């Protein structure tokens, strides 16, 4: 009974129709605003096609809200940093693979030239 | 002027001493709790070594808090999904590069065998 987007208990839970995954209504709608498709599912989904489901000191409460906000901001930051680093590594690997493809082509051409010269006797 | 962890105007801004980067005090302290070093800097940072710097309607405010939380949660989700996908792509590139290196070795051996066979004639 956890939202697949937030990992929390939804207040207005909705289940997809093309998949069986549960979401918080406002979160999945704000996600479909840009993409209009399920998160892993490649197929797009219409808006009225998510089946709905039914079911301390104030300064300290503000402090708790602020602490959770800080945690979310730091998590976003660290995930973006890891993403940037792995993107750099992927670009380096692609560069090296392009170089390897060129040298493979050169070796194939040289090998075939030598084999054809050998077939000539 | 902007915090490097949150991209927001800090109310208690602190600049690092080992680097020249600005942070919100509570955010950088909560970051140093686990790691105890600056975000790009491998070197660790002491806690009293961050130089400090000197200087509506409630339902709508709760709605704004809710919208900001939704935005942060969707950003975290999308960033983690992109991170996983790029990690998969990097692993695929590494496997493909190992295959390319093996093919380079085999092609070099065949090319040299053919060239040596031609050197005999």
Is B86 in contact with A90 (Cβ distance < 8 A)?
Answer: yes
User: CA A83, CA A104: separation in Å to the nearest integer?
Assistant: 31
Superfamily of domain A1-55 in CATH is: Zinc/RING finger domain, C3HC4 (zinc finger) (3.30.40.10)
> If DSSP states are collapsed to H, E and C, what string results for chain B?
CCCCCCCCCCCCEEECCCCCCEEEHHHHHHHHHHCCECCCCCCECCHHHCEECCCCCHHHHHHHHHHHHHHHHHHHHHHHHHHHHHHHHHHHHHHHHHHHHHHHHHHHHHHHHHHHHHHHC
**Packing angle of the helix pair A58-119, B25-34 (nearest 10 deg):** 60
Is B73 in contact with A77 (Cβ distance < 8 A)?
Answer: no
H/E stretch holding A34 reads helix A25-34
Contact A26/B73 with Cβ under 8 angstroms? no
Half-sphere exposure of residue B99: CA atoms within 13 angstroms, side-chain side: 7
This structure was determined by X-ray
Chain position carrying tokens 């680097």: B19
User: CA A12, CA B5: separation in Å to the nearest integer?
Assistant: 32
User: CA B6, CA A91: separation in Å to the nearest integer?
Assistant: 27
Contact A27/B74 with Cβ under 8 angstroms? yes
Tokens of A40: 């892993």
The separation between the first and the last C-alpha atoms of chain B, rounded to the nearest angstrom, is 76
Contacts 24+ apart (CB under 8 A), A88-95: A89/B90, A90/B86, A90/B89, A90/B90, A90/B93, A93/B90, A93/B93, A93/B94, A93/B97, A94/B93
Contact B112/A118 with Cβ under 8 angstroms? no
Chain B residues with a Cβ under 8 Å from any Cβ in chain A: 5-6, 26-27, 30-31, 39, 65, 68-70, 72-77, 79-83, 86-87, 89-90, 93-94, 96-97, 100-101, 103-104, 107-108, 110-111, 114-115, 117-118, 121
Which of A65, A71, A110, A116 to mutate against chain B (most B CBs within 10 Å)? A110
User: CA A29, CA A3: separation in Å to the nearest integer?
Assistant: 13
Contact B103/A102 with Cβ under 8 angstroms? no
Strand order in the sheet with A13-15: A22-24, A13-15, A51-52
Distance of CA B62 to the CA centre of its chain: 32
Q: What is the resolution of this structure in A?
A: 2.8
- CB-nearest to B100 from A6, A89, A104 is A104
User: CA A73, CA A71: separation in Å to the nearest integer?
Assistant: 6
Burial of A10 (0-12, 13-18, 19+ CB in 10 A): buried
């Amino acid at each position: 009974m956890l939202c697949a987007l937030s990992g929390e208990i939804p207040e207005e839970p909705v289940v997809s129709k093309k998949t069986g995954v549960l979401f918080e209504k406002r979160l999945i709608l704000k996600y479909l605003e840009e993409h209009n498709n399920i998160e892993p599912g490649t197929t797009e989904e219409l808006d009225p096609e998510t089946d709905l489901l039914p079911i301390t000191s104030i300064p300290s409460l503000l402090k708790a809200f602020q602490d959770e906000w800080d945690a979310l901001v730091l998590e976003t930051y660290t995930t973006r940093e890891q993403l940037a680093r792995v993107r750099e590594e992927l670009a380096t690997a692609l560069y090296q693979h392009d170089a390897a493809v060129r040298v493979i082509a050169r070796l194939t051409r040289e090998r075939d030239e030598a084999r054809e010269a050998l077939a000539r006797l």
